[PDB]
């Protein structure tokens, strides 16, 4: 009633001096139009269709149009307002606690996060000044994974998987890990990290947002949407969207990361884009710039040093291990552009062993650099012995080999985990010493998981204070170690 009037009230409509570009050539979503040459490149100009477009290609006699919309709702000849304004996102973390599109359209409702500053989304790569060694351990909440490859703040990483390969499960677990991290009062612990989905189902992403609502991780989270409905530029911009989204807070000193999944999607988008451009791309329909295209967002993985205020911009790629075909020129660049990659095994998951990281194939050069050293001591030999047991698993009756076999049995029975189990490196270092102790190697690796749940509960209850002590033990306290062996025997009785 009167409230609808009040909304209508104060409606602002101030006019301004502007010309436009009447469309000339229309078809396939790109208009080779004429006029409005007073627009600039990389700009975000808008048409009579209200759609705002980025600079496609100025012709000597025409003007090509790049937009990510639907021109079946646009007839030819339409006047395109030469906004000449570099395609710019909003600036600031207003999306924090908000789930918006790649262009800020919260199709999840929840109103607009009207970010009062606009990010000049024509951002560029970080340079050499802040480019220095990173030090912040990544609050991963993934027991073996973080154990296997601890990561730093600012990293240029990657991840590859097959259909429904837990890669989304991986991201969800990461988000879960961010809550207590974002509950960490320190901005290094506080996880103002980012996450975007690519080409995903709008409804699947809705289920994801439902989990996040259950997760309450929106405190840790801001959502930029690239669903399956995304246009080709839209997916293409999505990497740029996330890059500038990071840039706002990395320049706001934030130690955080961004989760876009999956980069392999916009590859289809860019391919179709070039195809619509009729320019001859290569294999995978791939034009050559695809790397440099990808590299544009890729170089944004900034460990922004004090030379950039101490913010962090960590980036981990998501391009699917399509049938685990490493030989993809797409994958070829994918490993080739990141300082690391998360290879995920399928057979374990095919054998149902979830998690199923490609322990043979996965590799990340971050490790103890930016990592809890306590678990590092507790489990460096553990990882080595896992490798040996694989070397032992490379056979099918040395009781030395048999011992290595039981060791690997426990190692496998332990390392994996279920979905949505956020935690710190605490129980990580705990079980790391415990298996490193191997005093349960006698225990059935089948019974290992059960007794593991048991020991975890025991620690969470009693040594919870001792757990805080070990947290204070920013070193292997022989006292904490003794408490460890003691409670180890204690829970062993409870087994």
């Amino acid at each position: 009633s009167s409230i609808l009037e009040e909304r209508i009230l104060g409606a602002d409509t101030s006019v301004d001096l502007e010309e436009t570009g009447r469309v000339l050539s229309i078809g396939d979503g790109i208009a080779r139009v004429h006029g409005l040459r007073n627009v600039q490149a990389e700009e975000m100009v808008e048409f009579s269709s209200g759609l705002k477009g980025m600079s496609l290609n100025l012709e000597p006699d025409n003007v090509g149009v790049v937009v990510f919309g639907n021109d079946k709702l646009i007839k030819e000849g339409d006047i395109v307002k030469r906004t000449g304004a570099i395609v710019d996102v909003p600036v600031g973390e207003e999306l924090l606690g908000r789930v918006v599109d790649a262009l800020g359209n919260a199709i999840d409702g929840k109103g607009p996060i009207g970010s009062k500053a606009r990010r000049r989304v024509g951002l560029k790569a970080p340079g050499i000044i802040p480019r220095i060694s990173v030090r912040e351990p990544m609050q991963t909440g993934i027991k073996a994974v973080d154990s296997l490859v601890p990561i730093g703040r600012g990293q240029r990483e990657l991840i590859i998987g097959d259909r429904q390969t837990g890669k989304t499960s991986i991201a969800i677990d990461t988000i879960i890990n961010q809550k207590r991290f974002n509950d960490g009062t320190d901005e290094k612990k506080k996880l103002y990290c980012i996450y975007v989905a690519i080409g995903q189902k709008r409804s699947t992403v809705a289920q994801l947002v439902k989990r996040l609502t259950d997760a309450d991780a929106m405190k840790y989270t801001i959502v930029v949407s690239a669903t399956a409905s995304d246009a080709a530029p839209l997916q293409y911009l999505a990497p740029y969207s996330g890059c500038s989204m990071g840039e706002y807070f990395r320049d706001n000193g934030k130690h955080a990361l961004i989760i876009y999944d999956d980069l392999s999607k916009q590859a289809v988008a860019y391919r179709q884009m070039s195809l619509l451009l009729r320019r001859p791309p290569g294999r995978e329909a791939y034009p050559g710039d695809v790397f440099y295209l990808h590299s544009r967002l890729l170089e944004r993985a900034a460990k922004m040093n004090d030379a950039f205020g101490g913010g962090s911009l960590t980036a981990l790629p998501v391009i699917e291990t399509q049938a685990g075909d490493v030989s993809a020129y797409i994958p070829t660049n994918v490993i080739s552009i990141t300082d690391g990659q998360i290879f995920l095994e399928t057979e374990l998951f095919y054998k149902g062993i979830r998690p199923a990281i490609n322990v043979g194939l996965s590799v990340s050069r971050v490790g103890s650099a930016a990592q809890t050293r306590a678990m590092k001591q507790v489990a460096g030999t553990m990882k080595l012995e896992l490798a040996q047991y694989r070397e032992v698993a490379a056979f099918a009756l040395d009781a030395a080999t048999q011992q290595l076999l039981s060791r690997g049995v426990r190692l496998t029975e332990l390392l994996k985990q279920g979905q949505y189990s956020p935690m710190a490196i605490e129980e990580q270092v705990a079980v790391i010493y415990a298996g490193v102790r191997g005093y349960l190697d006698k225990l059935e690796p089948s019974k290992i998981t059960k007794f593991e749940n048991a020991f975890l509960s025991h620690v969470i209850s009693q040594h919870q204070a001792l757990l805080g002590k070990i947290r204070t033990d920013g070193k292997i306290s022989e006292e904490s170690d003794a408490k460890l062996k003691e409670i180890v025997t204690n829970f062993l009785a409870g087994f």
Binding site: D28, G199, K201, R202, S203, T227, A228, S229, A232, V268, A269, R271, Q272, L275, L276, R278, R283, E284, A285, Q322, A323
Partner: protein
């Protein structure tokens, strides 16, 4: 073929009409006229189909394969609007028996050909994937209804790649 596929489809139709109260939507784009009449007779026999009895538990359509896919392809959004009619416009959950997707793939491929389009690497439309997802995306368990997709995954040489 002979795998109970028509049988299982009719089973699904009956289970929707009884176990869910939901009718069915038949849109057999590029259906054989022989197969068309056969399906008419068989579905009529099942009882969920009757062009007169007004108690048929389904809605029917089939397509001409002999016809240009430039005709045959568009039936997709048609069945989509139909699903909206029965679900968003008629408050129901519904599925859609649709054969075949790889047939729909060939349809989109011919469409891009009509575009004179640089075909996909699989010869499809340069963004045929866009509609393909939209094909998947156009139906969803939205608040408007539970739009389910009975999807015939026509195995192109059984080449999942």
């Amino acid at each position: 073929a002979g795998v109970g596929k028509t049988v299982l489809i009719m089973e699904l139709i009956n289970n929707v009409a009884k176990a869910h109260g939901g009718y069915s939507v038949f849109a057999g784009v590029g259906e054989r006229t022989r197969e068309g009449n056969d399906l008419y007779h068989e579905m009529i026999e099942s009882g969920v189909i009757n062009l007169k009895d007004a108690t048929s538990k389904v809605a029917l359509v089939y397509g001409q394969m002999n016809e240009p896919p430039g005709a045959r392809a568009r039936v997709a959004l048609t069945g989509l609007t139909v699903a909206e009619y029965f679900r968003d416009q008629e408050g129901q959950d519904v599925l859609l028996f649709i054969d075949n997707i790889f047939r729909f793939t060939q349809a989109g491929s011919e469409v891009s050909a009509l575009l004179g389009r640089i075909p996909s690497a699989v010869g499809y439309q340069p963004t045929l994937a866009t509609d393909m997802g939209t094909m998947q995306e156009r139906i969803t368990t939205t608040k408007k209804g539970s739009i389910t997709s009975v999807q015939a995954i026509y195995v192109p040489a059984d080449d999942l790649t």
